Amino acid sequence: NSTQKFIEDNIEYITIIAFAQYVQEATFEEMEKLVKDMVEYKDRCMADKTLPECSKLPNNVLQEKICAMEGLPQKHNFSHCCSKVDAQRRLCFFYNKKSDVGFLPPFPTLDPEEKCQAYESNRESLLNHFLYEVARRNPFVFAPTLLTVAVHFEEVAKSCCEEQNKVNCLQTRAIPVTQYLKAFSSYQKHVCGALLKFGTKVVHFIYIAILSQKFPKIEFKELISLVEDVSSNYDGCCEGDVVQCIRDTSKVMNHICSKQDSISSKIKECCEKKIPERGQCIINSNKDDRPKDLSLREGKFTDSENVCQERDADPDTFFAKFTFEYSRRHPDLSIPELLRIVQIYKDLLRNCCNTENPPGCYRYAEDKFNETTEKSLKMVQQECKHFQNLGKDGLKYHYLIRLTKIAPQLSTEELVSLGEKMVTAFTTCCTLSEEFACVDNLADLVFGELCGVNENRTINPAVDHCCKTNFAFRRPCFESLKADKTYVPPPFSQDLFTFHADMCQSQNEELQRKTDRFLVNLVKLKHELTDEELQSLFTNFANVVDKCCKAESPEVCFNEESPKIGNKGENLYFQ
Numbered sequence: 001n002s003t004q005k006f007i008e009d010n011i012e013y014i015t016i017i018a019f020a021q022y023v024q025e026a027t028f029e030e031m032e033k034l035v036k037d038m039v040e041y042k043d044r045c046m047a048d049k050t051l052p053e054c055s056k057l058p059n060n061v062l063q064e065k066i067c068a069m070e071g072l073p074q075k076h077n078f079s080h081c082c083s084k085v086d087a088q089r090r091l092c093f094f095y096n097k098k099s100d101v102g103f104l105p106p107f108p109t110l111d112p113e114e115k116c117q118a119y120e121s122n123r124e125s126l127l128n129h130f131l132y133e134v135a136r137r138n139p140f141v142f143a144p145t146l147l148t149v150a151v152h153f154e155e156v157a158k159s160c161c162e163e164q165n166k167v168n169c170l171q172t173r174a175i176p177v178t179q180y181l182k183a184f185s186s187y188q189k190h191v192c193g194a195l196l197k198f199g200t201k202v203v204h205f206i207y208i209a210i211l212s213q214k215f216p217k218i219e220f221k222e223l224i225s226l227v228e229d230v231s232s233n234y235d236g237c238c239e240g241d242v243v244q245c246i247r248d249t250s251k252v253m254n255h256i257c258s259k260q261d262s263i264s265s266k267i268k269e270c271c272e273k274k275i276p277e278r279g280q281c282i283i284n285s286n287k288d289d290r291p292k293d294l295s296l297r298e299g300k301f302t303d304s305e306n307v308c309q310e311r312d313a314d315p316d317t318f319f320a321k322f323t324f325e326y327s328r329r330h331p332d333l334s335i336p337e338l339l340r341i342v343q344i345y346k347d348l349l350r351n352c353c354n355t356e357n358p359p360g361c362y363r364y365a366e367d368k369f370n371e372t373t374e375k376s377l378k379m380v381q382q383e384c385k386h387f388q389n390l391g392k393d394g395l396k397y398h399y400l401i402r403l404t405k406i407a408p409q410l411s412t413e414e415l416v417s418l419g420e421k422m423v424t425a426f427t428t429c430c431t432l433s434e435e436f437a438c439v440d441n442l443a444d445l446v447f448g449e450l451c452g453v454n455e456n457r458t459i460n461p462a463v464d465h466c467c468k469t470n471f472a473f474r475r476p477c478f479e480s481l482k483a484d485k486t487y488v489p490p491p492f493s494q495d496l497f498t499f500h501a502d503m504c505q506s507q508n509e510e511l512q513r514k515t516d517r518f519l520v521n522l523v524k525l526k527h528e529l530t531d532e533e534l535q536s537l538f539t540n541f542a543n544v545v546d547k548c549c550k551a552e553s554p555e556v557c558f559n560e561e562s563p564k565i566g567n568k569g570e571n572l573y574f575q
């Protein structure tokens with residue numbers, strides 16, 4: 001079929017993505033040798049379909065070929081994976097991925113003129129190396145996403161190579177491609193992390209909630225059928241099985257498209273498009289309009305006297321149906337808010353169905369939902385007002401202080417990333433009509449990044465408790481945490497807190513990132529201080545920086561005018 005053709009056609013690209021994600025230390029020369037092995041396997045299976053290995057799991061084939069490369073498992077420290085076979089080997093390979101890609105060099109940027117020359121002379125080589133470099137730095141991003149990203153990156157290179165000011169074009173036009181990649185990455189890590197911590201049974205409520213919001217005219221049975229396809233799709237994609245991921249993604253899009261009528265109205269130009277665009281499209285299409293005849297409630301869950309019986313006959317399906325009906329009627333709610341509501345409903349019924357008069361007790365379920373949602377909504381409203389008052393940077397500094405207090409054991413680079421990701425929820429969403437849904441959806445992804453994808457991280461006991469107990473209530477849990485008062489920092493050199501003359505300028509993100517790192521390191525150093533004292537000290541340093549840039553020889557200015565943060569005898573290090 002078309003999917004098998006797409007895979008056969010793109011086998012070189014597919015192989016690079018898989019190899020680079022699994023073995024992020026592997027060199028580009030090493031990639032080329034695996035490419036030749038998989039092309040050959042592809043040709044062999046075409047010559048002889050009934051041969052044994054031609055019906056094996058795709059990952060089992062790829063991992064066999066990687067493990068067969070002389071000295072490679074030992075060179076990149078994955079010999080322990082190759083000493084296992086089949087499922088145990090697949091699991092080991094999955095555990096081998098590293099979220100922290102700081103062991104890699106800075107992304108190798110080509111000279112714009114040579115990049116353009118390379119694009120015209122050797123296009124396959126350029127895209128091959130791009131895809132290698134992207135995949136090893138984004139080990140959990142799903143293949144259809146990465147291939148779409150490569151396509152868009154190619155359109156950027158093609159268009160910008162025709163312009164006079166090539167550098168400005170490349171830098172500008174790359175921004176939304178990067179944002180796409182980072183948005184999908186965050187979302188995929190969130191779902192995969194949840195799958196590993198809690199299993200498919202808790203997690204497929206996520207897909208019921210999202211699909212029911214997006215396709216509110218769908219029938220329950222068809223939704224459940226689609227949810228089964230989606231859950232399988234996440235199983236393979238979360239594993240890292242690139243071939244199975246592509247196949248299962250194509251199945252989901254075909255399932256959706258082959259019932260366009262009786263699912264959706266707003267996906268026609270998507271059901272035209274190519275693999276894998278037709279599906280990155282469907283994912284980006286907006287929510288279909290609710291059936292005009294859909295009221296705000298379903299009295300079948302609060303007004304019927306059959307609730308406890310329906311629940312008892314099949315609790316999983318009963319709660320799936322609740323999630324379907326409630327989600328499709330509340331397009332304004334976030335996914336985490338819907339899952340909190342499902343849990344509250346489940347807890348409510350545990351109590352009510354064992355009381356003297358259950359119908360009199362569960363009749364008031366919507367009052368419980370109303371209170372919990374009002375609390376969430378008020379919190380978002382407060383955070384959005386704070387954003388309006390302080391701007392992006394000002395709010396970010398408050399988050400950096402709070403996050404560093406609560407999770408000081410994280411690297412500064414990580415804390416800085418988490419702070420930027422947190423503030424982006426507010427810059428993207430505040431003031432929109434679905435502000436609540438947008439903010440809570442995007443904010444929740446931060447704690448998904450924090451809690452880990454293929455590891456149960458051990459940060460500190462309070463953070464670990466929030467990561468591992470209760471997906472839907474994870475953000476509220478994090479909001480309740482106090483500073484970790486057991487923390488004692490390592491020494492920090494005085495140079496971490498020294499402003500250098502080269503930093504005086506107008507810049508986008510590297511100068512932003514330097515300021516952000518300063519604040520985080522300061523908070524680690526002075527963790528004992530109150531948030532207000534830290535904010536005050538930081539604004540002192542900020543004021544001094546601003547003046548000294550407007551001074552000529554800015555660095556002598558900084559050292560005479562900056563506040564001191566050392567204990568009396570400290571010159572080289574601060575403790």
Ligand SMILES: *[C@@H]1O[C@H](CO)[C@@H](O[C@@H]2O[C@H](CO)[C@@H](O)[C@H](O)[C@H]2NC(C)=O)[C@H](O)[C@H]1NC(C)=O
Nearest residue numbers: 095195196197198199200202454455456457468
């Ligand atoms: C991370 O934590 C999760 C949840 O505790 C672990 O997943 C469980 O692992 C046990 C034993 O391997 C299985 O019997 C359970 O079925 C798993 N539960 C779920 C919900 O998936 C996971 O193994 C941990 N990661 C490790 C130990 O590396």
Ligand SMILES: *[C@@H]1O[C@H](CO)[C@@H](O)[C@H](O)[C@H]1NC(C)=O
Nearest residue numbers: 073074075076077078079080
């Ligand atoms: C990787 O394996 C080598 C060879 O046994 C070992 O010396 C080294 O310590 C290992 N490195 C890591 C990071 O595990």
Ligand SMILES: *[C@@H]1O[C@H](CO)[C@@H](O)[C@H](O)[C@H]1NC(C)=O
Nearest residue numbers: 369370371372373374375377
């Ligand atoms: C809660 O109920 C009140 C009164 O009916 C209503 O005004 C409000 O919109 C509801 N809030 C939520 C979050 O549903």
Ligand SMILES: [Cl-]
Nearest residue numbers: 138139140141
């Ligand atoms: Cl990733």
Ligand code: NA
Nearest residue numbers: 102103104105
């Ligand atoms: Na590095």
